[PDB]
Amino acid sequence: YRYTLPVKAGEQRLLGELTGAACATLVAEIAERHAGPVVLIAPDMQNALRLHDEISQFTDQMVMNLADWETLPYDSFSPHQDIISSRLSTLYQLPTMQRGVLIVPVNTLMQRVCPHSFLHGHALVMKKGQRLSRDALRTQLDSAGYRHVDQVMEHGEYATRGALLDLFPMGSELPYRLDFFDDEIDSLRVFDVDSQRTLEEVEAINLLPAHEFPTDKAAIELFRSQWRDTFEVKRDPEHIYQQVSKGTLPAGIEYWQPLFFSEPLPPLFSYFPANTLLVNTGDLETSAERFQADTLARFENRGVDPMRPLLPPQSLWLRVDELFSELKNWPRVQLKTEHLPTKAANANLGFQKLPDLAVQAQQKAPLDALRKFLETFDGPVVFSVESEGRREALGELLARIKIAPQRIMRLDEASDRGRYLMIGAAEHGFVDTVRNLALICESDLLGERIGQPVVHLEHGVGRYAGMTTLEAGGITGEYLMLTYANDAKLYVPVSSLHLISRYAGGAEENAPLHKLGGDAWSRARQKAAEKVRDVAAELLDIYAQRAAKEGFAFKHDREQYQLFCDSFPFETTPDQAQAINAVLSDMCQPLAMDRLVCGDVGFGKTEVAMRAAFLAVDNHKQVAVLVPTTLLAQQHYDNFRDRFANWPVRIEMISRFRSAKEQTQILAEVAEGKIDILIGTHKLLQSDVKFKDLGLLIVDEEHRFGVRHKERIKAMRANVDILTLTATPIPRTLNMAMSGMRDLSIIATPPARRLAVKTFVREYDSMVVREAILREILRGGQVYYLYNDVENIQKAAERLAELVPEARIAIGHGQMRERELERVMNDFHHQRFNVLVCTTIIETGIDIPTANTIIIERADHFGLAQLHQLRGRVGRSHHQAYAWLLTPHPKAMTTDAQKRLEAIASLEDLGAGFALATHDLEIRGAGELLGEEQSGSMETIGFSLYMELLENAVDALKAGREPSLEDLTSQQTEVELRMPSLLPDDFIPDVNTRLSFYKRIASAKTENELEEIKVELIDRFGLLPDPARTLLDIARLRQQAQKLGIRKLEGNEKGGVIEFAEKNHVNPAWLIGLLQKQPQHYRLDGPTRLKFIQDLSERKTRIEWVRQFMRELEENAI
Template sequence: ELFSNLGQFARIRLSLAKLGTKAGNKNLSVCELPSIRIDHKQHEPYAAFIDYVTAQKKKKSRILLSVESDGRRESLLNILKPSGLKFKEFDTFEQFTQSDSDVGLIVSPLEQSVVLGSKPSLSIITEQELLGIKVSQRRRRKHKYEASQDALIRNLAELKEGQPVVHLDHGVGRYQGLQTIDAAGVITEFVTIIYAGESKLYVPVSALHMLSRYSGGEESSAPLHKLGSDAWEKAKKRAAEKVRDVAAELLDIYAQRQAKPGNKFTLDGQAYRQFSESFPFEETDDQRNAIEAVLGDMQSKQAMDRLVCGDVGFGKTEVAMRAAFVAVNDGKQVAILVPTTLLAQQHYENFKDRFADFPIEVGVLSRFNSTKEQKDTLENMANGKLDIVIGTHKLIQQDIKFNDLGLLIVDEEHRFGVRQKEKIKALRADVDILTLTATPIPRTLNMAMSGMRDLSIIATPPAKRLAVKTFVRQRDVELIREAILREIKRGGQVYFLHNNVETIERVAQELSEWVPEANVITAHGQMREQELEQIMTQFYHQKYNVIVCTTIIETGIDVPTANTIIMDRADKLGLAQLHQLRGRVGRSHHQAYAYLLTGDPKALSKDASKRLQAIESLEDLGAGFALATHDLEIRGAGELLGDDQSGQMQTIGFSLYMEMLEQAVNALREGKEPTLENLLQKQTEVDLKLPALLPDDYIHDVNARLGMYKRVASCANLGDIDELQVELIDRFGLLPDAAKNLFSLQQLKMQASNLGITKIEANPKGGYFEFSQNTKVNPSFIIGLIQSAPHIYKMEGANKLRFAISEANARERLKMVTAMIADFEKKVSH
């Protein structure tokens, strides 16, 4: 038997057990595939595979191909179609073994290829080994937020009618929903947008790349452009000029950052593995990715500046601990900067506990320490006796000295001011900086999205974690009493947030009267350190079941039994604060509740209403990043490199501004002048007069359809198209013809765009190709076409090639145009 180790053997037996097969030690071996892999780079990619199948058939042996989902099955059949091999599909392993088929295809969880028996044998070949790659199908999340920056900002799937949208050519209008229109016998779905003067624009779903959500300011103050006026062109031009300056400045910052020498940390694999294994939970995929990204940054020559964004309790602290371990293990000191003394104390205890088995000294600097303790800590920092120090603002004072600082971790960076952040950066030129936050402030988010800072998102909740149920209600005694009683009766505890020290004792007294069953205590920031620490400890040990407190608990001790929070006058709190405070509950596997109490709803300001709406609607786990993008829309994005909070983004919307900025940076890098034309790269227009849409009986939900259309239009390569088709098949079933057409047209667009073809049109009687000034298609090839068949091909003007080929069948027309594009690709000018 061919096994590299016993673990591999055990894994294969386990996989086969899932298929209902009993595999003993004697009739099972790993199937080695290097010689039969399908290699697309070869002239005949299927040759070796076809030879293998033919040889196995001669030996009377059987072959079963295994894929991991229905979508992957369709994708593999598509790949194998040119080979001419016919694979019968089976639902179960047993069905195949009882059939008389030589070759079959099955959906199964098997990851490694195996050979069962000897003569005749059965080879089970997995797709990922046949293609020589790990199938990287993205696992869909259970919540509705994609953890990709693009998807969150450019996502159209959450659009409601009446919200502002930006069209690249026509400006800002208001979204009016999707509409199916029969245009000359071809059914197409259109996005309807209304402009000033009740003018309507119908945008075909194939041109959805032209649309983006308007964000970067209040919806009510978003402009409404007039169709056909030059106001939009002027706005784009002004934005392009601004973008060019920002891009130049950005590149300067990039250059400085690249030149800034960082400390190249060395990773001790064995010690790091020992430390990682002491983590009592299983890492989520996102957490693992964030850890890998941080360690990668630390091992590079450049100084790290990474932002890790993840919800409260999603494991950001573990990312920080791993980074701290690597730094200390390589002989450097680590400073951890936190906004509150309570959080400093909590981190200190957590770090002490986690590093207890290692020769690593952890210290804390906060007002909970006596003057002597603080003095000792400072001395130990300066002479190198302390490896990790956790502290509040004291850590960034001028007189603080480190022996050899290598890593600075900033927790909850939105709680620090701009000047404090500048001080942090000035601390040491070559210090690696790791920033942790649940809801990044708009400016930070903006910087991360423009590439000035590296960004990792932890959007996967830990196992068994439930979302906090959130209610926005007017303040009512009965509601408060009911919420507190429900929690107490199930043995839990309650946070009652009242952010006013002067009246906090009176509120605590009222609660005791309304709920005599409650054992109430108060906590606020004006108490003496020892008293506050004692109260929080008593609450943690369940001596009290209701704590009336100020926002001091925002970054406080984790209390797993506290699963209800009531926020008095929640309308006076910021969005990040609301989200952060809500994260104080629901830290265990119990269902948690958050009540956001307000005054008279009519008296609420517009922004306060929006904040409360946002926090109530985004109660899913992992919503912190999405909330930050809402914050971006409510408060404005903030100029990247200045103090102006609205800037040029207000006029053209955040998405389009960021797109232009990205293009400008790329143009400058390539030594080109960023002009308005090359900042707004348009996709090729393709109109083949064939139905290309996702029918409403295939995807019923309008917003889900709109989101999918946008994702199709945003596909950048064939891999993206394949992956999206796989996802659709797995979620909604086999693709209808109109949906297949939609993907074929997108593939055609990408190929045409790469060739410098700006427009393709084809109807039953013929059509044309329109070329850009810098097309890659060889002019001599075009001349040859016209000379060989002048009755079919002719030039119209300098850049339009007409063809007179009659083809009434829409599918055949698509095949014909695809073949012509393939011919153009073969004759590219170099």
């Protein structure tokens, strides 16, 4: 209490001296101190996006928010089905709600409603409890706007089997199976279609109006009449209005739906109950005014297309004048974080500033800063948790100060200096005086940041069996089961794992066996040494000769760079920042240019090198590429001169239009040298390609041709250098030379449009293809289709256009006029033809934004570079993405098809191992003699050892002690404590999950590694009990002791022994000190080892001793 709120309309009980989520959860409380529901401003999306969970921490009640359109005013990108399902779900609960809250930003409120006319266009939620017809239902669905298919994935379609028919609901993300029985229906079930399983049995079904707008024949004809009432157009058939007057659907057409009726729909102030109330933040007025400014900017500057009516934004949407004038109807919460003038409306709530929270790892007790503050104030610390692992970590590092809060879920009651905790997710916090405490965590302190063969060093080559629980010699054992010689049964220490690798070879015989230790399996080391001789000598001459290659000085003037680079409208993934900064450091480095990269022809992963175009200015030198086509060539050209426009930018190219007149211009530019760039052609290279001042070059995909052109560009480097890559290189044998010949910047952004990618394969059929079409054509999507470009491609087109009598498939014929294909590319820019396809080497180069799908037609007549090139030319941003394939029957198709099918199964994502996917395929493409002698060996013995001999060869090349140490006879420190302790099967049955955990574990060596894996496993899989925590403390003592190099431990409460490091940082002062202090718990075995004795009853006692004494030893014994 002691604080009030407005109770009439236009009553601004304004608020000052405020805070972040503090005042947010405050107004949550005032939601408790309020009649019904309320709403608020959002200055932007991300703010409330965080803030949802921020208050959800400290609030019993509920709140959600709409989804923003995510398009832009007079853009062309179109919104999603899912956001709009969220929006309806958010709005039509208004007339249903009594308490709880919703939210919205300053922007989507100005957008005018597609109102309850939709809702009032019922139906709505229903059940099976009726003598109910489904023909009638589907009639109400075309009233709603769903349709028929054989299989459906999104809203707007459905499919029957027999007579039972199924669909996708909107308000629920689930798919549903619908359970028809002759009006004697009994059940109704949730279903997932990548599951192909019926899942969760429901009471009811939200049969809301099932589109963005329900649009039937008359609705359509009056949209048509409506445009005709506004303005008039031509009879040209690929006008968007004319097109949809043909009963059709492009993407951004939604943008005219708000002009469906004269009666406008100002914001949703119209809808709420009288009690509901408003909120300020930042500047609604200025945000809105600049919103207007940019919308109308976009209007006039983009008000240029003839086939696209740009429209009166005041007619479309609304303005601040009438917006504040309506919301006069209700009062608000006027909030800003500051002390203010004196007015009875004002609050000036008693919040103050947190202190500075610098804690530098360099120091001794930089931690204490808080602690020294603690005694000086009554403030409890019931503060944020972000996770269960965060609870664990933060508690243990609160034992670094000898405090341990008892997590209190409630908010303000806690004691003066009450030490408790709860969940949080914010960053910035403050101080209070009305409640004399703070709201902080480490954020403000420091912020953040299977049917398997297998190969194994010590004992050979084997295969999967699982894992052998057991009672070890007085303690538990849980070991791995490996299968080799004579049913070699191997129970294996899981702690081993790091010393084992995958099958790492080809399926023929590359895990033959091992029998008796000292044998060929250890001459694995011999051949590691011979690789370390020959190919390391190759590397030696390489980085002797390829390394130096000096260059020039390249002073930055960053200001003009990022003047020119602010325009990048993919607000970057910072890994891209790693990429640019490393490569420009190589640039600014006056030495050899080299950096190897792999990504996608997928946009984003294609253009960042063009930032070096800026670097190709100040030097005032030349660059180029061989775009193997002309199509991508002018694509590049266009986006360059757009991005790179208003300053001395001058390029022409080479095309397939290369007349003698073109060629004269080529002379003109290349012998001018002023001109910036050239862009290649199939017949570019051995032409005497002319340069005066050549900075550098980039290029990709020499695949089916020889490296003829690679050595020939080796001829094209007169006192100058290169900087190239490929998106889909070969086996990295040459690129692993580049791990030694050319460093790598293979960052290529996984994130920033990680979107749905639906890629499958099915048999030859008209109707299934047609189904794919009827998925993509609904906004003018796209697939692509193939042919030999030899036989009757036109009749392919004929059949296709025939099966789709309604659409416009174009002439996708390769080897016709560059003129004609250029027109075709214009239609790709425009899509006069809503559809077109593309086939072979001289056709297929790049992925398009507006496209969404592709299909394959002869993966029975296919090939190697076919796969590995089609993999690059697929992409889409911020919508669903798709693909399918065609097959004849695998009865007909051969091994090769099945190799590619194994590939297909191995297509899931660009996750951690897309490259590993390509690699196992290239084991399926087993014919490498790249590492010629090395190939058979590393296959037989494992590319594990390839990496091993790589590192040893490299480090000992620079150290010159090359042939063999390997730590192969010994590379691991050892430990035991007599702990019945291991991974529990409580959480998971799958053992390959456990293998994964052992992967991250035995691989891990660092505090961040282990704590991060801890947080992962605990939050995903709850507070898993003690023993694996003991395994992790074992991992940490391994971290310390093997950074030190200790040899062995065996432990127990009977005592134990240690083979201490014979080679560490010793200084025996502590040894004679503990002699004088303790002979029992320190009885040194000779000068040699160290037997010890403890009555440490509980394993907690054991580890506590172990921890404190490793710390003691860190201070002393080293």
